[PDB]
Design a protein around this nucleic acid. Structure first.
Lengths: 49, 50, 49, 106, 274
DNA sequence: CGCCGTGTCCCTCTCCCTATAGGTTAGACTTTAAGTCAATAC
DNA sequence: GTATTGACTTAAAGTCTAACCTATAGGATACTTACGAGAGGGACACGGCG
């Protein structure tokens, strides 16, 4: 909400996003950091016993 | 691939002049009711006095 | 059906050029004033917005 | 409601394993800007090139063919010249000179 | 005029010229600056005339202040070519240039697809003629009769009617109202349809397989002839050059290899692709 | 005489014609890559 | 059937010439100003206290 003012004052502040919420990870299309996306479950090594 | 236009005269961005609170106004301590008179060629300003 | 042909005519619409739009429409215009009796049916209105 | 960009997509497969050899040329503007253009090998090199900046640049190689640019199309002086004469304008210049003389010292 | 002559004469006398007398030097500097002053004054005087002539060309094509500025440019051109010895009011001569400049800038700067001025003039003439025929004749002008009045061919009239069409926006009505931008209901014929790509790759692999099942070097001559690896076909001269042979043998090889691929075992796994 | 709160209001966001000069293309001529046949040898 | 050469004809193209577009200029009597609410924030006025 209020895209213009947020965008312009973020541009002034040079505010760097860190891409760690559940929305900015949806906007850019990479895997979200919740559920099956976090590194605890996303990096499981599976070998036959 | 993007392009660009080389303007023959400098122009001001609208987001930093018109959107309240005006950012040019706060940076320069100028009132928007008067900043509009400047940037739309309605009133002079002094850029340097000796 | 022929009834829909008859009822598309004889229809009063409060929206259009020179009238209020749905976003400009308040709640108080959408009620049934007691002066509708015999001049405008309080039953038949579209169920949507 | 169909539509097209007035273009055509070719379903060709990339062949980076061999391309035609490409030479590289260095062009330079007047204000010290450098630009690299990978021109075709079996092709002519135009010394005067329109570069990425937008102004006309020349090759760093020394050729300088000097295409003999055109004179200004028409001046105010050309337009007055064709509708009057030199001595008429000299008379008017004398008139204004003696006018400001008679204004200044009386 | 005196100031322009004076600046010409200093420019002439500057080159290889004179150590000018101080009073003469200073005062035709004054003359040269005053020529520009008087010019400037004349343009300021007749800007309102420019506005008055441009006020009637609004409501179509361009904005208002754009037309004002083209009129101002025409005014600079008019004060550049104004002669006073003919003894005429300045407005009479200047109106000519103002109208010319305004109509030119309207012609070649008021369409998204730029139509050159001659075709703009013929389009405007056709529009005026069809308008007057609609007003007077009443009966809607048929294209061939418009050609007869136009003294051109009917197909030229049809091409003119096609050229005049101006572009709509992609952000207008969905079908009737502006609920959704129209650009959200236009397909893309220039796009990967995602069955063509996979079908095309499968065709590639199957054609390579059938070519491999053919004979040795002759299937490859077919491959070079239709350019399946180099991307360009090359001719019998080049195939002979790379192999050290003649051209009639190449054509015989082409015909022999071509005969077998018409036979069903090679064609049955290839026919469905065409 | 010199500065500070409260109030009101404005604004923004959300649900003609002519004349000259120059570039473009279309159209035909001669050359070349291309398709063709006839005899032949292994 | 598969390896050739020597003519023998044929469809597809670089270059010169002509017309048809294209950028450009010019064209004198005198004309001179169009045609709903609902909330938050900021700026301008007015009055109160030391």
């Amino acid at each position: 909400q209020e895209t213009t003012r947020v965008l312009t004052d973020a541009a002034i502040n040079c505010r760097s996003d860190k891409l760690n919420g559940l929305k900015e990870n949806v906007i850019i299309g990479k895997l979200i950091p919740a559920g099956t996306g976090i590194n605890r479950y996303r990096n499981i090594a599976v070998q036959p016993t | 691939r993007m392009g660009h236009i080389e303007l023959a005269a400098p122009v001001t961005h609208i987001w930093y002049f018109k959107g309240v609170p005006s950012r040019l106004g706060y940076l320069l301590d100028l009132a928007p009711k008067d900043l509009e008179k400047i940037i739309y060629f309605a009133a002079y300003v002094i850029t340097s006095v000796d | 059906n022929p009834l829909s042909g008859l009822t598309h005519k004889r229809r009063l619409s409060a929206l259009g050029p020179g009238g209020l739009s749905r976003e400009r429409a308040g709640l108080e215009v959408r009620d049934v004033h007691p002066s509708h009796y015999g001049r405008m049916c309080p039953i038949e209105t579209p169920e949507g917005p | 409601l169909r539509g097209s960009r007035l273009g055509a997509v070719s379903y060709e497969t990339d062949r980076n394993h061999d391309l035609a050899p490409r030479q590289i040329a260095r062009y330079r503007t007047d204000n010290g800007e450098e630009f690299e253009v990978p021109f075709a090998d079996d092709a002519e090199i135009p010394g005067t090139w329109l570069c990425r900046n937008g102004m006309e640049g020349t090759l760093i190689e020394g050729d300088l063919p000097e295409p003999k640019k055109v004179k200004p199309p028409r001046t105010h002086w050309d337009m007055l010249l064709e509708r009057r004469s030199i001595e008429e304008l000299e008379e008017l210049l004398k008139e204004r000179l003696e006018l400001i003389r008679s204004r200044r010292r009386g | 005029e005196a100031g322009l002559y004076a600046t010409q004469l200093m420019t002439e006398l500057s080159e290889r010229g004179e150590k000018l007398p101080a009073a003469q030097r200073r005062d035709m500097m004054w003359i040269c600056r005053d020529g520009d002053r008087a010019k400037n004054h004349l343009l300021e005087a007749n800007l309102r005339l420019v506005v008055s002539l441009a006020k009637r060309y609004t409501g179509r094509g361009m904005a208002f202040l754009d037309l004002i500025q083209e009129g101002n440019l025409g005014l600079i051109r008019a004060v550049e070519k104004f002669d006073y010895t003919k003894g005429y009011k300045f407005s009479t001569y200047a109106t000519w240039w103002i109208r010319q400049a305004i109509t030119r800038a309207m012609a070649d700067q008021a369409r998204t697809i730029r139509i050159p001025v001659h075709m703009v003039e013929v389009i405007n003439k056709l529009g005026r003629i069809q308008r007057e025929l609609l007003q007077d004749l009443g009966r809607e002008p048929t294209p061939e009769e418009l050609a007869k009045e136009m003294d051109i061919t009917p197909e030229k009239v049809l091409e003119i009617q096609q050229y005049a069409r101006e572009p709509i926006s992609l952000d207008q009505t969905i079908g009737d109202e502006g609920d959704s931008q129209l650009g959200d209901f236009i397909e893309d014929s220039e796009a990967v349809v995602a069955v063509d790509a996979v079908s095309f790759t499968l065709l590639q692999d199957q054609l390579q397989s059938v070519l491999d099942t053919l004979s040795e070097r002759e299937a490859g001559v077919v491959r070079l002839r239709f350019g399946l690896t180099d991307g360009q076909p090359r001719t019998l001269d080049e195939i002979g050059q790379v192999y050290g042979v003649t051209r009639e043998r190449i054509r015989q090889i082409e015909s022999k290899t071509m005969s077998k691929l018409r036979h069903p075992s090679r064609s049955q796994v290839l026919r469905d692709y065409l």
